[PDB]
Design a protein around this nucleic acid. Structure first.
Ligand SMILES: [Mg+2]
Ligand SMILES: [Mg+2]
Ligand SMILES: [Mg+2]
Ligand SMILES: [Mg+2]
Ligand SMILES: [Mg+2]
Ligand SMILES: [Mg+2]
Ligand SMILES: [Mg+2]
Ligand SMILES: [Mg+2]
Ligand SMILES: [Mg+2]
Ligand SMILES: [Mg+2]
Ligand SMILES: [Mg+2]
Ligand SMILES: [Mg+2]
Ligand SMILES: [Mg+2]
Ligand SMILES: [Zn+2]
Ligand SMILES: [Zn+2]
Lengths: 97, 206, 81, 25, 217, 120, 87, 96, 129
RNA sequence: AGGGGAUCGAAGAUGAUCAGAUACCGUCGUAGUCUUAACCAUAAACUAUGCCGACUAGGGAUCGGGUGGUGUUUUUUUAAUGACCCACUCGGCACCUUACGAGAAAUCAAAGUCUUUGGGUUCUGGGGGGAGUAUGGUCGCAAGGCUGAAACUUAAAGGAAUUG
């Protein structure tokens, strides 16, 4: 039977959203049924930061991070990203952690 | 049967405002509470403490009136109510329950927590909700110390109060024990400031 | 709740209800008399304008309309009745 | 067999019986 | 020897309560089956239905045995025990015990006239357990109990001389039907008929009048 | 890994329950107690039992321990009960909100009057 | 529940809830009877004398047992204000 | 009120609508379509008397295993051919 | 839109009793509503009620005791002929010793035993027990 | 039927993978994808939940309208505004907790006020398979759409929940 009150995800009072393509497998998928992870990560990394300023002009420079929004397909979101799977009760909890 | 001067006196009115028993819950208000008196600006609702004293008199009026005073159960699982109920229990008949309730106490004769009271008194029907639920299986009346948010299901005779902390619990239980001795009891005449100190209640420290 | 007086409700909680949900419904809108000391006499205005009301003799202004009670213009006074 | 394919099965099956019949029209 | 617990257990052995109608009057819950033994000796049981049920365990298979028992006199007291245990006899033993604790009264009545000794029901009652509704209808004297043999015995023990019945649901599941007929007769005493409008004073509890002659040691 | 079974920790429970005014924090004497006071079927179970009732004994002397209340502590806490003399009619007057005082004049009479306003 | 000639038949006239006038029946084990004892001159709660109220398990479950008790007691005179018939 | 029109003047709709749904009843349909008289080997008659054509051993269905010994019969009022079982051990030696 | 003003009255009264209240505000009353509420009250199933006058169709505040299990309206007003009142009461009444079907005769809105005494018949309004 | 034809891409052809591999992956790429004029009338066109009306229960957010304030933030000289805060009220999109109540359950502020069975009205279903098949009519350029049987077969098919 019915396994979710939000059905797939988060559509009430619309009837049509518009699809986005999945970053991983390219599968089209509704925007509100997708699963989005903001990717904000520094350009460099853990390691290269010390050797950055060491080889760099300017005091301390700036360090400009890169921001890109990720869109996953379920099946691709399941294969890696936010999934696990949850118990019948633990599913309900929309808390991010 | 309105007695005479069992009215709320300034000796007592001062006591209550001292512990902030009149300072009620914030935005949260159960629709079951006329016990309000206007509302303070910025979040707080003022409790009408005559209706508190008048209820506390009625709780006292029921507590005494149980033929054997020793089965009238005071209960707090809250830490702020344990020092109070033990100090309520000692002064009156009142078998106490502090700390953990151990569900199955009012059903299940087999348990070693087993009680069978003709009355029950409770500080916080949220924290103590197990006790309220368990008594409602066996036909057991329930007095309750209730704030403006308290779950009034299965509590008769609620005493509007502040369970947000501090001396209110100790105060209400100090007056509750005080007024059941003033009823039928070994106590005394009118003003009677009553030798025992009110800070003898109050969960202590650290 | 569970028992109360529906025949004689409190005047405070009757005051907050919608004009159709009172015990016997009636309007919440009032009439007022307005003056702008250029003019000696006073026109009577409905609190909710629609029309932007001009005074007796001179074309001046009184209130512009809104989604609601009319904003009265600038220097003016009003009584209510 | 998938209902959709089972439907396409008889869609075809009908257009053919449609054919053979009209050859006798 | 008995040796009770529950202040209500003492007060009955203490000889301070003659009848269970006292217990019902005050809605006192019964936890000790000997209470309704001394209070109602003439209880005769009936073992209504026994059927196997089966659980699949991480080692093996448990097939235990479910039994359904009905006790009553026939004066207006019945009870519905249902118990499952891994032996037919053991489940019947514990089931008759639960049928004891469960006993509830019945308001009988007259079909159409005020004559001797009510043979029928006060009102129409329905009750529904699971998918089954069993409906009980007032019946003229000598109409008998019109019900399937299961429901008939539960009604006969309950003391009913003449009643009409109708059922709706999957009635071949014997367990839900009796629990429904039980809820049906159990509802006769929740029904406010004009003769019960007269105000009573509100009697005083046996747990108080005899309070000293009860409680603990 | 030495973790005492329930039969050991269960028997130590009932022993410290009723025999506390006896025993000690010395294992050796407690061991000999469990002979004269209790019927055990083997020397090993008894040293195991007595050894743990010694431990439960050893820590009851500092702080209570869940599972054993011999009724002696509950009236040790009753005779331990007192605190106070300060309370909480000084100094000056009770500082109340606006409506708190309006609550006074509504049902009330003389009260020390100190009022404050606050804000958003 | 009388019979042909006069005789009370049909055992056990039940209690009644004090708020709702609805029968309280045997298997309602969520019901309650609150005993409020009468007082006398200068304190003194008078054992063995009560003004009693019986509240059905229904009302208790619906959260009305408290406010409904105020109306009941205050109307019998053992409360002075606390309860307002208007809202 | 979910569906059925409750008005006092809705009788026509009520019988029309019930007249309709009786066709979902298998028996009402069969009896009005005259399927008895139209289809079926007997005319709708209680019995019918034919003539034996061949003798068949019929292979029984699972999970049985047997040979059921019937007779092909041509109904005399019909010419309709019908296969019919011969009960009771032997009795195939009773026909011809 | 409102197809029986009696209907919404009786329903709201029943949701009072079921929810354990002592009073109910019904709208927009009517002549038929009143004489229904009277037949109940004169056998005691409700208390005093008050017509309030809005300049519209009216309102009523009914006080009810709790002796009332159900009141309900038969929504098509069927015609009853004097010997079919037997069949109506028998269908929807809890038992032959109490409770009434109340109907509308040319002799006015009256319960079924008053109808049996006055020997008039008519359509059927509702029932009360 | 014109136009457009960047992209992606039924078909087809390929490189691989496979025992095979008419596929999944890679490549090429026709139709298509966009637009105008005209057809077609179907989707799990889904909330798998007709519409109008009434009644039955709490809670905090929020979208739109409005009302109230010797509220905050905006400085200028106070305002006026605007954005904000707090209370109430309509009318929305939803969530939360309750369960009086309903249900076979999952669950449900309706899926409640239902054997204590009647507010008004429309529609569809009557075991499974046969089969949305045959046939007739009708619409369409076509693909197909609406309407839509029976013979025969058959003791289950099915729903939710439980333990494995
Ligand atoms: Mg599935
Ligand atoms: Mg859609
Ligand atoms: Mg040809
Ligand atoms: Mg059987
Ligand atoms: Mg059909
Ligand atoms: Mg052949
Ligand atoms: Mg012929
Ligand atoms: Mg290809
Ligand atoms: Mg190839
Ligand atoms: Mg493969
Ligand atoms: Mg379709
Ligand atoms: Mg402003
Ligand atoms: Mg078979
Ligand atoms: Zn993907
Ligand atoms: Zn002017």
């Amino acid at each position: 039977p019915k396994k979710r009150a939000s059905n797939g995800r988060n559509k009430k009072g619309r009837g049509h959203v518009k699809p986005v393509r999945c970053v991983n497998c390219s599968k089209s998928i509704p925007k509100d049924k997708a699963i989005k992870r903001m990717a904000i990560r520094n350009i460099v990394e853990a390691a290269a930061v010390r050797d950055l300023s060491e080889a760099s002009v300017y005091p301390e420079y700036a360090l400009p991070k890169t921001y890109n929004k990720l869109h996953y397909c379920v099946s691709c979101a399941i294969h890696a990203r936010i999934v696990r799977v949850r118990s019948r009760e633990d599913r309900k909890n929309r808390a991010p952690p | 049967s309105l007695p005479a001067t069992f009215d709320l006196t300034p000796e007592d009115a001062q006591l209550l405002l001292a512990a902030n028993t009149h300072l009620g819950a914030r935005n949260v208000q159960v629709h079951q509470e006329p016990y309000v008196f206007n509302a303070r600006p910025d979040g707080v609702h003022v409790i009408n403490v005559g209706k508190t004293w008048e209820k506390l008199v009625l709780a006292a009026r029921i507590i005494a009136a149980i033929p054997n005073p020793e089965d009238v159960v005071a209960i707090s699982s809250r830490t702020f109510g344990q020092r109070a109920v033990l100090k309520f229990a000692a002064h009156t008949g009142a078998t106490p329950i502090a700390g953990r309730f151990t569900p199955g106490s009012f059903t299940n004769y087999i348990t070693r927590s087993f009680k069978e009271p003709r009355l029950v008194i409770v500080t916080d029907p949220r924290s103590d909700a197990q006790a309220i639920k368990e008594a409602s299986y066996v036909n057991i009346p329930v007095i309750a110390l209730t704030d403006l948010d308290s779950p009034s299901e299965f509590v008769d005779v609620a005493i509007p109060c502040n369970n947000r902390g501090k001396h209110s619990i100790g105060l209400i239980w100090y007056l509750l024990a005080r007024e059941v001795l003033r009823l039928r009891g070994a106590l005394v005449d009118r003003t009677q400031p009553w030798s025992i100190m009110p800070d003898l209640y109050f969960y202590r420290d650290p | 709740v569970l028992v109360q007086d529906l025949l004689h409700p409190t005047a405070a909680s009757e005051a907050r209800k919608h004009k159709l949900k009172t015990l016997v419904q009636g309007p919440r809108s009032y009439f007022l008399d307005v003056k702008c000391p250029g003019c000696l006499n006073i026109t009577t205005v409905f609190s909710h304008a629609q029309t932007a009301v001009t005074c007796e003799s001179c074309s001046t202004i009184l209130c512009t309309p809104t989604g609601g009670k009319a904003k009265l213009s600038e220097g003016t006074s009003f009584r209510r009745k | 067999m998938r209902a959709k394919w089972r439907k396409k099965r008889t869609r075809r099956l009908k257009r053919k019986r449609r054919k053979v019949r009209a050859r006798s029209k | 020897g008995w040796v009770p617990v529950t202040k209500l257990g003492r007060l009955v052995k203490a000889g301070k309560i003659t009848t269970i109608e006292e217990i019902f009057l005050h809605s006192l819950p019964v936890k000790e089956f000997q209470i309704i033994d001394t209070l109602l000796p003439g209880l005769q049981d009936e073992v209504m239905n026994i059927k196997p049920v089966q659980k699949q365990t991480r080692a093996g298979q448990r097939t235990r045995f479910k039994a359904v028992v009905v006790v009553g006199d026939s004066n207006g007291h019945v009870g519905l025990g249902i118990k499952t245990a891994k032996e037919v006899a053991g489940a019947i033993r514990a089931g008759i015990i639960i049928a004891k604790l469960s006993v509830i009264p019945i308001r009988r009545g007259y079909w159409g006239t005020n004559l001797g000794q009510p043979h029928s029901l006060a009102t129409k009652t329905t009750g529904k357990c699971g998918s089954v509704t069993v409906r009980l209808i007032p019946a003229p004297r000598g109409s008998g109990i019109v019900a399937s043999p299961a429901v008939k015995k539960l009604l006969q023990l309950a003391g009913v001389e003449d009643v009409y019945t109708q059922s709706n649901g999957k009635t071949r599941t014997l367990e839900n039907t009796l629990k429904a007929a039980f809820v049906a007769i159990g509802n006769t005493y929740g029904f406010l008929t004009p003769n019960l409008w007269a105000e009573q004073p509100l009697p005083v509890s046996p747990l108080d009048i005899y309070s000293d002659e009860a409680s603990a040691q | 890994g030495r973790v005492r079974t329930k039969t050991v920790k269960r028997a130590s429970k009932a022993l410290i329950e009723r025999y506390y005014p006896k025993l000690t924090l010395d294992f050796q004497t407690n061991k000999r107690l469990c002979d004269e006071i209790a019927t055990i079927q083997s020397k090993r179970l008894r040293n195991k039992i007595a050894g743990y009732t010694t431990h439960l004994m050893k820590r009851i002397q500092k702080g209570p321990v869940r599972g054993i209340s011999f009724k002696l502590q509950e009236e040790e806490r009753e005779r331990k009960d007192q605190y106070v003399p300060e309370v909480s009619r000084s100094n000056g007057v009770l500082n109340v909100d606006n409506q708190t005082s309006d609550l006074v004049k509504s049902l009330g009479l003389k009260l020390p009057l100190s009022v404050i306003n606050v804000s958003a | 529940m009388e019979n042909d000639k006069g005789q009370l038949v049909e055992l056990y006239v039940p209690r009644k809830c004090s708020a709702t006038n609805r029968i309280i029946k045997a298997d309602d084990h969520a019901s309650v009877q609150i005993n409020v004892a009468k007082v006398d001159e200068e304190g003194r709660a008078i054992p063995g004398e009560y003004v009693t109220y019986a509240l059905s398990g229904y009302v208790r479950s619906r959260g009305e047992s408290d406010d409904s008790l105020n109306r009941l007691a205050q109307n019998d005179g053992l409360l002075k204000n606390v309860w307002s018939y208007s809202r | 009120g979910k569906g059925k029109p409750r008005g006092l003047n809705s009788a026509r709709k009520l019988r029309v609508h019930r007249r309709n749904n009786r066709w979902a009843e298998n028996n009402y349909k069969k009896r009005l379509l005259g399927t008895a008289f139209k289809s079926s080997p007997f005319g709708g008659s209680s019995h019918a008397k034919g003539i034996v054509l061949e003798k068949l051993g019929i292979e029984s269905k699972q999970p049985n295993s047997a040979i059921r010994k019937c007779v092909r019969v041509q109904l005399i009022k019909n010419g309709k051919k019908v296969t019919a079982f011969v009960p009771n051990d032997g009795c195939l030696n009773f026909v011809d | 839109t409102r197809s029986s003003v009696l209907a919404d009255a009786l329903n709201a009264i029943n949701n009072a009793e079921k929810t354990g209240k002592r009073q109910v505000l019904i709208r927009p009353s009517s002549k038929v509503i009143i004489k229904f509420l009277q037949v109940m009250q004169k056998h005691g199933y409700i208390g005093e009620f008050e017509y309030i006058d809005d300049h519209r169709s009216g309102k009523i505040v009914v006080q009810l005791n709790g002796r009332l299990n159900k009141c309900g309206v038969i929504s098509p007003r069927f015609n009853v002929k004097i010997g079919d009142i037997e069949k109506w009461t028998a269908n929807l009444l809890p038992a032959r010793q109490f409770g009434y079907v109340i109907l509308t005769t040319s002799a006015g809105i009256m319960d079924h035993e008053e109808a049996r005494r006055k020997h008039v018949s008519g359509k059927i309004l509702g029932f009360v027990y």
